[PDB]
């Protein structure tokens, strides 16, 4: 009588939808401009889609983490490369967010375009004070075209614009909407701290397995698969990303 | 700068507090009466705690699935047709798709307790429920009670321990998210019976159900506040047995 149903949408699919949204904001902001060297600061797992996509508009792309012609470097290899004069990027994209890359390190560079990701979502006094986005933009006001990447959920609460944050809130809200469907007993959001699995337990197998999980597991009296999927889709479509020029 | 905090309360702790609430409701209903030969229907895992605690006011104690004796519905029925079991106390925790009234009609207890699976109103869940057709064959040749469990001024589709666990932890994660300096709050939940009965992975089951209820990304140390949110949501759960 009581059925158990997994959604066909996985967590990685939600994550990809958001990554694609942020990337298209970036691609819209760049117009059709081509670069020789792109440097993207951020964690590999959230930045890889943008790196892979920007590689078609660049001769070389670096992904720098603070951990195919795309190179992956932690921040110290990159600093050694810079001091040696082996890197000088015309495009810089900072996706680090809260407690991320330092303004004085950025001030050393001279790109044609700088894009910084604003981590702030709905207002939070502590998150507001910890944010230093505009101190990161300050050193470029006479060096480059500066844009601030913003991502919000339309008329919803999200404390940050982070892909993980948005993923969590999207899937949790969807499980609560699904719960309210006729005949549904409950809806489990299948989520985990993925960065913890990959970067602090170094278990690629477990990471790939938990992130490939069905987004929602539903205990229900009715086949609500299609409705659950469209609910999940509606919440994904609530996410809006754009780059504001300074 | 950005901290990651696991709550000290794990999912099993939530599960045990709900199971405990339901049990205290049941013994409040039994008012210290003692029995010998008790049968408890339900899925073992939700059905346990009640069995071992009822073992102190009883004896032989049976836990039947679809010290304490553990049974498949099959050994229990074969034992009954052969005439080796006749219980004075019956507690039915099977809920929505459980034991049929015609099979219950075969028994002759002094006391009967059935769990009402309905929570907040749902037309299909309401219709699928047949609690009172289960109470019908005893409706006073024996003392009959209905175990009801709700979240005060909150929505839950059933009174199931799994359901209440989920809704409690998810809601707690939403309140914790609203704290100043919190970036996000992950509710660590899993379909445990799927792991245990359908993948036969005791190690994976134990590992998953022992997970911290909530993993928090935050600027501030909010551990105590998170624990208190979680506790407040657990205390919203009210359980009682109504006498017919």
From Swiss-Prot, chain A:
This is Uncharacterized protein MJ0489. InterPro entries: HcgC.
């Amino acid at each position: 009588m009581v059925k158990t149903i997994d959604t066909k949408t996985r967590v990685v699919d939600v994550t990809n939808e958001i990554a694609k949204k942020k990337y298209q904001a970036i691609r819209d902001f760049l117009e059709g401009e081509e670069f020789k060297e792109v440097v993207i600061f951020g964690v590999y797992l959230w930045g890889n889609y943008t790196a892979q996509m920007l590689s078609k508009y660049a001769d070389k792309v670096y992904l720098v983490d603070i951990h195919n012609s795309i190179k992956f470097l932690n921040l110290n290899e990159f600093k050694l490369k810079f001091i040696r004069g082996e890197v000088n990027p015309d495009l810089i994209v900072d996706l680090t967010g809260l407690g991320g890359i330092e303004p004085e390190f950025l001030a050393k560079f001279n790109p044609k375009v700088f894009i910084v990701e604003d981590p702030k979502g709905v207002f939070d006094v502590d998150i507001y004070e910890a944010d230093n986005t505009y101190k990161r933009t300050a050193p470029f006001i006479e060096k480059a075209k500066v844009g601030v990447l913003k991502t919000y959920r339309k008329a919803r609460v999200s404390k940050t614009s982070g892909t993980m944050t948005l993923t969590i809130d999207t899937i949790v809200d969807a499980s609560r909407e699904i719960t309210s469907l006729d005949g549904v007993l409950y809806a489990i959001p299948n989520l985990r701290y993925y960065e913890g699995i990959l970067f602090h337990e170094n278990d690629i197998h477990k990471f790939l397995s938990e992130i490939s999980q069905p987004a929602i597991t539903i205990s229900t009296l009715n086949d609500v698969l299609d409705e659950a999927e469209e609910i999940l889709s509606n919440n994904i479509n609530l996410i809006y990303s754009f780059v504001e020029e300074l």
